[PDB]
Amino acid sequence: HCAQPLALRDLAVVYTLGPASFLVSLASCLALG
Amino acid sequence: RMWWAFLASSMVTFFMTSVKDWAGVMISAQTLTGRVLVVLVFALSIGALVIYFIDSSNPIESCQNFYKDFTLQIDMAFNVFFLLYFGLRFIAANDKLWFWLEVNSVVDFFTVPPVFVSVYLNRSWLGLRFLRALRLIQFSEILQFLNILKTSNSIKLVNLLSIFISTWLTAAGFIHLVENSGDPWENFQNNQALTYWECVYLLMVTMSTVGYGDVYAKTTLGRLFMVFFILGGLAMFASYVPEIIELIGNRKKYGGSYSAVSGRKHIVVCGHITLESVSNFLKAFLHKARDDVNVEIVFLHNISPNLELEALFKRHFTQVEFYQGSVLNPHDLARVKIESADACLILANKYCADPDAEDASNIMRVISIKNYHPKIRIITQMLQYHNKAHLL
Amino acid sequence: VNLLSIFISTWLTAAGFIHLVENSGDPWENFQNNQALTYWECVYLLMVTMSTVGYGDVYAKTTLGRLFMVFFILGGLAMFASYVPEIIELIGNRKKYGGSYSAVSGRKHIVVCGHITLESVSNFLKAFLHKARDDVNVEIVFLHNISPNLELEALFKRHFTQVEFYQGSVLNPHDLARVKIESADACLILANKYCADPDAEDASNIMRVISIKNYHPKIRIITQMLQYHNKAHLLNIPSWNWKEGDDAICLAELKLGFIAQSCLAQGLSTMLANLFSMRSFIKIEEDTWQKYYLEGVSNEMYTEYLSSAFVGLSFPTVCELCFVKLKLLMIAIEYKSANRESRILINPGNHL
């Protein structure tokens, strides 16, 4: 149990993952239309 | 303790004409596609609320991955569908600043990124996911699309109840999240373990001002928000509800239908129902010397009685009933069950400006009563002798 | 703002009083009975007290403290019953029917004004919103300056999904802008049929027509007219176009013409009434006059452009072919001319 509490590799992307997903969905909606 | 990352994800996330027309058509509730999409998103919001309810008993921070538990995967799928729905919403409208601050948009902004990070990364955190409760405000709306609700009053009442429940559950989730965690300045060692349902019970006690005190918020943040919640509740109760509650409390007094009882005959009295005429008619008809006491007098006048006539009816309540209506309207005749009435007595306005007009009115009342039920006895008062011939 | 400011002021001042009294002790108790209380906790105690919740987690323990809270309770009840409640009731006042109709694209709306009472609205909604009407997307918005009573409120309520009301006068252009009459399909004007003087009511309706035309000339107006001779005033308006669709429903001429033509042939009033009015479907199986009456009522009076195949054929022959082959009854023909405007011809002869 309890593999790792910290990860800088994933921390470099955790900040942008939400906006990344939202922008990808927005662009998909724009392109499919 | 990595709640900062899952909060900052949502925080950062929050911070062509032809396709716009297409999106506006699809999102519009006028089409069936938009109706079905709204129904699906409401059902998914209910599912997300149920997921939060189950996960409330779970520890707030625990490491998990998608393959470990299924409910995590269902919640992820719900978040993906919410993301698609939000994209459609935002691309639908011409102006974008409203969707930059829209309530459903901000709820999605605060609920999607935390799941999107918690699905794969460890330290799964029950963040601001209780905000899915706010989607019950739209509940009344779906009852409109499904044609179950057909009355404006009932729709308004359902909307009021939905908003009440949504605010209750949202604030309960807020209190649960603030109490289970500690004060950030206090190194999270001053937290109090509170069940979500215990938080709901606490909020119900506080809104009613019962204040039992068995359960209360002990953290500084929890108390500060309790003070903010009583402020908001008092303001909403003084502003949002009271006019509508008074609207719900409005009621007609004398509207209704006569409840007949077998073995007790009734006579229907109409015409000039006024304090003087009713007084005289009652002092003569209901004199204490009558052995015929089983007869009940039902009065039918379209004017609502004043306080003195109300008192007059009150004194003889055990024999006298009143209803607001006119014998000209067949529905009002049906209300007093005049088809089974022993007799109909018409009182005349003796002190009338034009006796002929009043006699004509009484004759036409006789015509109405006869048309509804020909085989009923009628005793009508006649001001002028020559007007009796019309009855022939 | 003044009310909120005085609320915050008295709240913080009383909280400071509690904090000062509780942090110290009773002077006769040698200050050893004191309770340690942070100022914000005192503010929280005051707010859970004034809202009458009363948790009991935090409370005053000193004699002077509990003495002040008794006083703070009595004073707060006095201020809530004397100082604030009148202003609170003042703010809670709100105009019910003020507002603007928010237009929805694809949902045409008509604006109805004039004599808006129980009887006129009841009749107009009974005839306009008959359940047989397939044309349903048209929404009616009423505009009359007098606030509706309780029973008219209920009448509007029973058709809440298709009928809206707004308080104002068509004479005021702001009220016209509120109901978005520039995008309205048409404006109907109801007339007070039972008035002491028909001329005054007709003149009022004509001003209503003038105001609506002035706001937006390119709008259709259907107005009820009490007297025949008052219709001439409508010809005075340059914006009044009969060819566009503006019509004047003169109640007197129509009713008395119905009665006169019935005198010429009894039942013609019923004929035309069942022609242009719309009814629900009722089936009679038993052999009575009512069954035949229903097949009679089933017909409705329509208009349509004739095909080129009938050009060069006399009206009797065209009617013959329409009745025999198409089961259509030729009633009238709109004649077109350049020297004269289009005229209706009732049963043209062989020569035409």
Nearest to B68 by CA among B3, B130, B118, B6: B118
Interface residue of B20, B230, B326 to substitute, partner C, most C CBs within 10 Å: B230
Q: Residue C157 and residue C153: Cα distance in Å, rounded?
A: 6
Q: Residue C69 and residue B94: Cα distance in Å, rounded?
A: 56
What are the angstrom distances between the C-alpha of C348 and each of C318, C325, C345? 11, 20, 6
Name B300's bridge partners. B270, B323
Helix (H) and strand (E) counts in chain C: 13, 8
Between B and C, how many CB-CB pairs are < 8 A? 47
Chain A: nearest CA to B108, how far in angstroms? 10
DSSP state of B305: P
Interface residue of B85, B89, B122 to substitute, partner A, most A CBs within 10 Å: B122
Length, in residues, of chain C: 352
Q: What number of CA atoms fall less than 13 Å from residue C40's CA on the CB side?
A: 8
Residue with tokens 């089409």: B31
Instruction: For C220-235, give the DSSP string.
Output: EEEEEES-GGGTHHHH
DSSP state of C193: S
Nearest to C256 by CA among C245, C247, C244, C269: C269
Whether B43 and chain C come into contact, CB under 8 Å, resolves to: no
Q: For residue A12, which residues of chain B lie inside 8 Å, CB to CB?
A: none
Which residue in A3, A4, A14 is closest to B9 by CB distance? A14
Cβ-contact B338, B365 below 8 angstroms: no
Whether B84 and chain A come into contact, CB under 8 Å, resolves to: yes
Contact criterion met (CB < 8 Å) for B234 and C51: yes
Residue C334, classed as helix, strand or coil, is strand
Whether chain A lies against chain C with 3 or more Cβ pairs closer than 8 A is no
* Per-residue tokens: B122: 């460890």
Length, in residues, of chain A: 33
- What is the identity of the amino acid at B148? I
Q: Which residues of A touch B (CB under 8 A)?
A: 1-5, 7, 10-11, 14-19, 21-22, 25-26, 28-30, 33
Q: What method was applied to determine this entry? A: cryo-EM
- What is the identity of the amino acid at B351? Y
Q: Strands B124-125 and B61-62, how do they pair? A: antiparallel
Contact criterion met (CB < 8 Å) for B230 and C56: no
Q: Which residues of C touch B (CB under 8 A)?
A: 40-41, 43-44, 47-48, 51-57, 88, 92, 94, 106, 157, 160-161
Contact criterion met (CB < 8 Å) for C48 and B243: no
Which residue in A5, A21, A30 is closest to B91 by CB distance? A30
Instruction: For C116-184, give the DSSP string.
Output: -SHHHHHHHHHHHT-TT-S----EEEEEESSPP-HHHHHHHHHTTTTEEEEE--TTSHHHHHHTTGGG-
CA-nearest residue of chain C to B217?
C57
Contact criterion met (CB < 8 Å) for C44 and B223: yes
Chain B: nearest CA to A10, how far in angstroms? 8
Q: Residue C298 and residue C288: Cα distance in Å, rounded?
A: 16
Through-space distance between the first and last CA atoms of chain A, rounded to whole angstroms = 46
Q: Residue B204 and residue B201: Cα distance in Å, rounded?
A: 5
Q: Residue B246 and residue B288: Cα distance in Å, rounded?
A: 43
Write the CB contacts of B208 (distance below 8 Å, at least 6 apart in sequence): none
Between A and B, how many CB-CB pairs are < 8 A? 64
**What is the resolution of the experimental data for this entry, in Å?**
3.9
Nearest to B360 by CA among B330, B338, B391, B331: B391
Contact criterion met (CB < 8 Å) for C55 and B234: no
Whether B94 and chain C come into contact, CB under 8 Å, resolves to: no
- What is the identity of the amino acid at C118? L
* Per-residue tokens: B60: 């707030």
* Per-residue tokens: C41: 């906790």
Whether B259 and chain C come into contact, CB under 8 Å, resolves to: no
Contact criterion met (CB < 8 Å) for B213 and C52: no
* Per-residue tokens: B362: 């009484």
Contact criterion met (CB < 8 Å) for A29 and B23: yes
Q: What number of CA atoms fall less than 13 Å from residue C8's CA on the CB side?
A: 5
Q: Residue B343 and residue B330: Cα distance in Å, rounded?
A: 17
Neighbours of chain A (3+ CB pairs under 8 A): B
Length, in residues, of chain B: 392
Q: Strands C220-225 and C186-190, how do they pair? A: parallel
Chain A: nearest CA to B118, how far in angstroms? 10
Contacting B residues, span 13-52, partner chain A, CB-CB under 8 Å? 13, 16, 18-19, 22-23
Cβ count near B233 (within 10 Å):
17
Residue C63: which H helix or E strand, with range? helix C63-82
Q: Residue B175 and residue B179: Cα distance in Å, rounded?
A: 6
Residue A7, classed as helix, strand or coil, is coil
CA C11 to chain centre: 46
Whether chain B lies against chain A with 3 or more Cβ pairs closer than 8 A is yes
Q: Residue C5 and residue C53: Cα distance in Å, rounded?
A: 23
Residue with tokens 């995967």: B73
Residue B201: which H helix or E strand, with range? helix B196-207
Cβ-contact B119, B66 below 8 angstroms: yes
Nearest to C11 by CA among C57, C48, C66, C63: C48
Q: Residue C198 and residue C206: Cα distance in Å, rounded?
A: 12
Contact criterion met (CB < 8 Å) for B223 and C92: no
Interface residue of C40, C48, C49, C149 to substitute, partner B, most B CBs within 10 Å: C48
Q: Strands B296-301 and B266-271, how do they pair? A: parallel
Chain A: nearest CA to B121, how far in angstroms? 8
Write the CB contacts of B66 (distance below 8 Å, at least 6 apart in sequence): B72, B73, B76, B119, B120
Cβ-contact B125, B60 below 8 angstroms: yes
Q: For residue B83, which residues of chain A lie inside 8 Å, CB to CB?
A: 21-22, 25
Write the CB contacts of B5 (distance below 8 Å, at least 6 apart in sequence): A11, A14, A15, B117
Helix (H) and strand (E) counts in chain B: 15, 7
Cβ-contact B217, B202 below 8 angstroms: yes
Which residue in C40, C53, C92 is closest to B230 by CB distance? C53
* Per-residue tokens: C150: 């309780």
Which residue in A16, A25, A33 is closest to B83 by CB distance? A25
Contact criterion met (CB < 8 Å) for A33 and B22: yes
CA-nearest residue of chain A to B15?
A19
Q: What number of CA atoms fall less than 13 Å from residue C306's CA on the CB side?
A: 20
Rg from Cα positions in chain C: 36
Q: Residue C48 and residue C119: Cα distance in Å, rounded?
A: 54
Contact criterion met (CB < 8 Å) for A14 and B116: no
Q: Strands C343-346 and B61-62, how do they pair? A: unpaired
* Per-residue tokens: C279: 């009814």
Residue B303, classed as helix, strand or coil, is coil
CA-nearest residue of chain C to B29?
C104
Neighbours of chain B (3+ CB pairs under 8 A): A, C
* Per-residue tokens: C169: 């006068």
Q: Residue B78 and residue B50: Cα distance in Å, rounded?
A: 12
DSSP state of B386: G
Contact criterion met (CB < 8 Å) for B91 and A22: no
What are the angstrom distances between the C-alpha of C81 and each of C7, C47, C75, C89? 14, 18, 10, 12
- The sign of the CA dihedral B279, B285, B288, B293 is negative
For C175-199, b where at least 16 C-beta lie within 10 A, e where not — what string? bbebbebeebebbbbbbbeeeeebe
- The sign of the CA dihedral B165, B166, B170, B176 is positive
Contact criterion met (CB < 8 Å) for C88 and B30: no
Residue B300, classed as helix, strand or coil, is strand
CA-nearest residue of chain B to A16?
B9
